[PDB]
Amino acid sequence: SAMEDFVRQCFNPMIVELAEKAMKEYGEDPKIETNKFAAICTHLEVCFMYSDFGEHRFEIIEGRDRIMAWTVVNSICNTTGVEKPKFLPDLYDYKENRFIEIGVTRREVHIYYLEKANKIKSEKTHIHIFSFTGEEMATKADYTLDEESRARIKTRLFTIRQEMASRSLWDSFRQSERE
Ligand SMILES: O=C(O)c1[nH]c(Br)cc(=O)c1O
Ligand SMILES: [Mn+2]
Ligand SMILES: [Mn+2]
């Protein structure tokens, strides 16, 4: 276990339940794919944090089931004209009027940024990558959030990494490229 216990102790029950739903839909067991379990939990929490740091600025798309997520995306596109994205993004920014793809990587932020940008192939989806070392990379170096919110996200990620390290789980996670 170990990784399972750490996930249950460091993430709130709602996030853990959402991640378990994601993995049960993928056909993957969270007791076997422990690293993917933790990665999904971390990504969900970063998305929720990003959103909470907003007159209601961000619409959360991640964390919903596919049907609801695409319903939300379609409503946004129909009421703003913003082009519908090819792949499901993570948030929508009502202030900048643009979708946001959030990335959390155990590798260098620029490697994962290139990977995500090559993947999404949509010039209009904004991309924000965070690492577990306090580094970030965003489209056009536009980081959207203010310094304090980004710092809180960075601190949470670093703290997750250090919690894993104290439990001897960081090495496997970092090499597990489940992201
Ligand atoms: O939306 C998704 O399904 C998704 N999948 C991976 Br893999 C990494 C992400 O950041 C993300 O948002
Ligand atoms: Mn997503
Ligand atoms: Mn994402």
Author numbering: -1 to 52, 73 to 197
According to the publication:
Among the most important influenza virus targets is the RNA-dependent RNA polymerase acidic N-terminal (PAN) endonuclease, which is a critical component of the viral replication machinery. PAN is part of a heterotrimeric RNA-dependent RNA polymerase complex, which is composed of PA, PB1, and PB2 subunits. The PA subunit, which enables endonucleolytic cleavage, is composed of a C-terminal domain that is mostly structural and an N-terminal domain that is catalytically active. In native PAN, the Mn2+ cations are coordinated by His41, Glu80, Asp108, Glu 119, and Ile120 and five water molecules, producing an octahedral coordination geometry at each metal center.
To account for the electronic and lipophilic effects of adding this bromine substituent, a direct analog of 1 was synthesized that contains a bromine atom (2). Compound 2 was used as a control to determine whether the addition of a bromine atom negatively affected the metal-binding ability of the MBP. As anticipated, the addition of a bromine atom to the MBIs produced no apparent change in the binding to the active site metal ions (compare structures of 1 and 2) and aided in ligand placement within the electron density map. Both compounds 1 and 2 coordinated by bridging the metal ions through the phenolate donor. Compounds 1, 2, 3, and 5 present the same triad and display similar binding poses, coordinating Mn1 through the ketone and Mn2 through the carboxylate, with the hydroxyl group bridging Mn1 and Mn2.21 The binding and inhibitory activity (vide infra) of these compounds are comparable to those of the parent MBP 1. Compounds 1 and 2 showed similar inhibition activity, indicating that the bromide did not impact metal-binding relative to the parent compound. Both compounds display high binding energy per atom (ligand efficiency, LE). Using a pH-metric titration, the measured pKa value of compound 2 was measured at 9.79 ± 0.01, showing reasonable agreement with the DFT calculation.
